[PDB]
Design a protein around this ligand. Structure first.
Ligand SMILES: OC[C@H]1O[C@@H](O[C@H]2[C@H](O)[C@@H](O)[C@H](O)O[C@@H]2CO)[C@H](O)[C@@H](O)[C@@H]1O
Ligand code: NAG
Ligand code: NAG
Ligand code: MAN
Ligand code: MG
Ligand code: MG
Length: 435
C-alpha cells in the first residue's frame, strides 16, 4: 500500500516504563498507530475509493499487485472517527464511534518512532499493565497481545509497501486472517468475497501470537499460540486453517492456543464482577515469562494487584489439570482432559513462543466484537453452545449462549470502552508490589 497525503497521520502519544530489578523505572515516550484495515483506502491520484463497504473497485484493483501500486492508506482522525484517545500513560478505545460514519472497534500498535513498531523480547521478564474492563459486557473483548510483526511494517522487502508501520501495515496472527486488505506488500482483492461473519480474500497472514490479555468484565484468558514459522507467512485459502477455513487445524499455526481462563479451569469465584479480582474497578495484570536453565520459555505466570493486594492466579481445579500457570505439563493435561486437539504442541509449543520472542514481538491493543463466535469461547456458560457444561472445558463464563451477537451488542453496548494504562516491562518482580 501507498502513503496517502490527503490527511496527516499523527500518532497519539503513549508513554510506558522500563524497570530495573530493584523496581526503579524510567519512561519511554512511545506512540500508537491504527491498523491499516480501519483506514480510508483511495487512489494515489485523488479521493476515489479502492475499497468501501465490503467490495473493491476492480478498475483500481484488478489484481493484488496493481491494487497495491494504485491504492493509498491515509491518515486517521483517532478520537473523532475511531474513538481512540491516548494521554500520558493511558490508552482508551471506545467500542462504537458515530462520526460521519459508524465505526466499530479498533486495533492499535505501540510504536518506537513514526516508522517503526516497538519490539519486545520478554524472556526472563514480565509485562505489566493496569486495565479498566468495567465497561465491557458480554460479547466484547479488550485484547492486549503480541505478534512478531516486522518492526518496519514490511517495507524493507516489499516494493509496493510504502505505508509500513507508519500506517499500521503488517498484521499477522495465529488465526491466519484472510479479512486483511493488505498482506506482505500486496492487496488481497483476488478471491475477495463478502462474508457476514467477518469480507475474506484469497490469502491469509500467519504468525505466532501471545494473547497476554483477552477479557471483558465477565471472563479473561491468557493464551500463547504456536506457529511453524513464528514471523509472517502467507497462506492460500482453506489451507490457511484458522477461523475462516473449512478445516480449522489444517494450517501451519495453532488457532486455539494453550489457554488459562480461571473460570474454564474450574474457579468461578475468582475473576468477575464482585469477585476476587473485581472487574467493577481497575486492577493491575502481571504476566511473567520464566525460562529453563537454557533460556527457553517454560512457564507463564500471572499475578493481579487490586487495592494494593497481590493476588496469585487461581489454581486450576479440574481433575487432571493442576496448577495456576501455563507450563508444558499444564498444556498437555488440559488438552487431554478437555479433549481439544493439541495444535499448541503440534506447532512447537514453548519453543515456538521462545523463537517468537527472539524475533521481537509487537504490542497490540484492541477492542472488538466477534462476528464468528460472538465471543462465546471467552465468556459463555457453554462453548460450543450445544455442549454439556458438566463436560470439563465447556463453561468459560456466565454469559448466555445467545449473548454477544454483533448486531445486538453494537446497539445495546454502544457505550462500551476499555482503558489500558501504566504499561511496565522489566525483570521478574520489578514492575509490581503490594501486600
Ligand atoms: O476462533 C475463536 C477463538 O478460538 C479460541 O480457541 C477455542 C476453540 O475455538 C474451542 O474449540 C476450544 O474448545 O476452546 C478454545 C479456547 O477458548 C482461541 O483461543 C481464540 O484465539 C479464538 O479467537
Ligand atoms: C473505480 O475507480 C475508477 C478509477 O478511478 C473510477 O473511474 C470509478 O468511478 C470507480 N468506481 C466506483 C464504483 O466508484
Ligand atoms: C517473585 O514474587 C513471587 C510472588 O511473591 C515469588 O513467588 C517469587 O519467588 C519471586 N521471584 C523472584 C525472582 O524474586
Ligand atoms: C452471515 O452468515 C453467517 C453464517 O454463514 C452467520 O453466522 C451470520 O450471523 C450472518 O447471518
Ligand atoms: Mg493474493
Ligand atoms: Mg460491572
Amino acid at each position: 500500500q501507498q502513503i496517502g497525503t490527503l490527511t496527516t497521520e499523527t500518532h497519539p502519544p503513549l508513554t510506558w516504563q522500563t524497570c530495573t530489578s530493584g523496581g526503579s523505572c524510567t519512561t519511554n515516550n512511545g506512540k500508537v498507530v491504527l491498523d491499516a484495515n480501519w483506514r480510508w483506502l483511495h487512489s494515489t491520484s485523488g479521493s476515489t475509493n479502492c475499497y468501501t463497504g465490503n467490495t473493491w473497485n476492480t478498475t483500481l484493483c484488478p489484481d493484488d499487485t496493481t491494487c497495491a501500486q494504485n491504492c493509498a492508506l491515509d491518515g486517521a482522525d483517532y478520537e473523532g472517527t475511531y474513538g481512540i484517545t491516548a494521554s500520558g500513560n493511558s490508552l482508551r478505545l471506545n467500542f462504537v464511534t458515530n462520526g460521519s460514519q459508524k465505526n466499530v472497534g479498533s486495533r492499535t500498535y505501540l510504536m518506537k518512532d513514526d516508522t517503526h513498531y516497538q519490539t519486545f523480547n520478554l524472556l526472563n521478564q514480565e509485562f505489566t499493565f493496569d486495565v479498566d474492563v468495567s465497561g465491557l459486557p458480554c460479547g466484547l473483548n479488550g485484547a492486549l497481545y503480541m505478534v512478531p510483526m516486522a518492526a518496519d511494517g514490511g517495507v524493507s522487502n516489499e516494493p509496493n509497501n510504502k505505508a509500513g508501520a507508519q500506517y499500521g501495515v503488517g498484521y499477522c496472527d495465529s488465526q491466519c486472517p484472510r479479512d486483511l486488505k493488505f498482506i506482505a506488500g500486496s492487496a488481497n482483492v483476488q478471491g475477495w468475497e463478502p462474508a457476514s461473519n467477518s469480507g475474506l480474500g484469497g490469502n491469509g497472514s500467519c504468525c505466532a501470537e501471545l494473547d497476554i490479555w483477552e477479557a471483558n468484565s465477565i471472563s479473561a484468558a491468557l493464551t500463547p499460540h504456536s506457529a511453524d514459522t513464528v514471523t509472517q507467512t502467507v497462506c492460500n485459502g482453506d489451507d490457511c486453517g484458522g477461523t475462516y477455513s473449512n478445516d480449522r487445524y489444517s494450517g501451519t499455526t495453532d488457532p486455539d492456543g494453550c489457554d488459562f481462563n480461571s473460570y474454564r479451569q474450574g474457579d468461578t469465584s475468582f475473576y468477575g464482577p464482585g469477585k476476587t479480582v473485581d472487574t467493577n474497578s481497575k486492577f493491575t495484570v502481571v504476566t511473567q515469562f520464566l525460562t529453563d536453565s537454557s533460556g527457553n520459555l517454560n512457564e507463564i505466570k500471572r499475578f493481579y494487584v487490586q487495592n494494593g493486594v497481590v493476588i496469585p492466579n487461581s489454581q486450576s481445579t479440574i481433575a487432571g489439570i493442576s496448577g495456576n500457570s501455563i507450563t508444558q505439563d499444564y498444556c498437555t493435561a488440559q488438552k487431554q482432559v478437555f479433549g481439544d486437539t493439541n495444535t499448541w504442541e503440534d506447532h512447537g509449543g514453548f519453543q515456538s513462543m521462545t523463537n517468537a520472542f527472539k524475533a521481537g514481538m509487537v504490542l497490540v491493543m484492541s477492542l472488538w466484537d466477534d462476528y464468528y463466535a460472538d465471543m462465546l469461547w471467552l465468556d459463555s456458560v457453554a462453548y460450543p453452545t450445544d455442549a454439556d457444561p458438566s463436560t470439563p472445558g465447556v463453561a468459560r463464563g456466565t454469559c448466555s449462549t445467545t449473548s454477544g451477537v454483533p448486531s445486538d451488542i453494537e446497539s445495546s453496548a454502544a457505550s462500551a470502552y476499555v482503558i489500558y494504562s501504566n504499561i511496565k516491562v522489566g525483570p521478574i518482580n520489578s514492575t509490581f508490589s503490594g501486600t
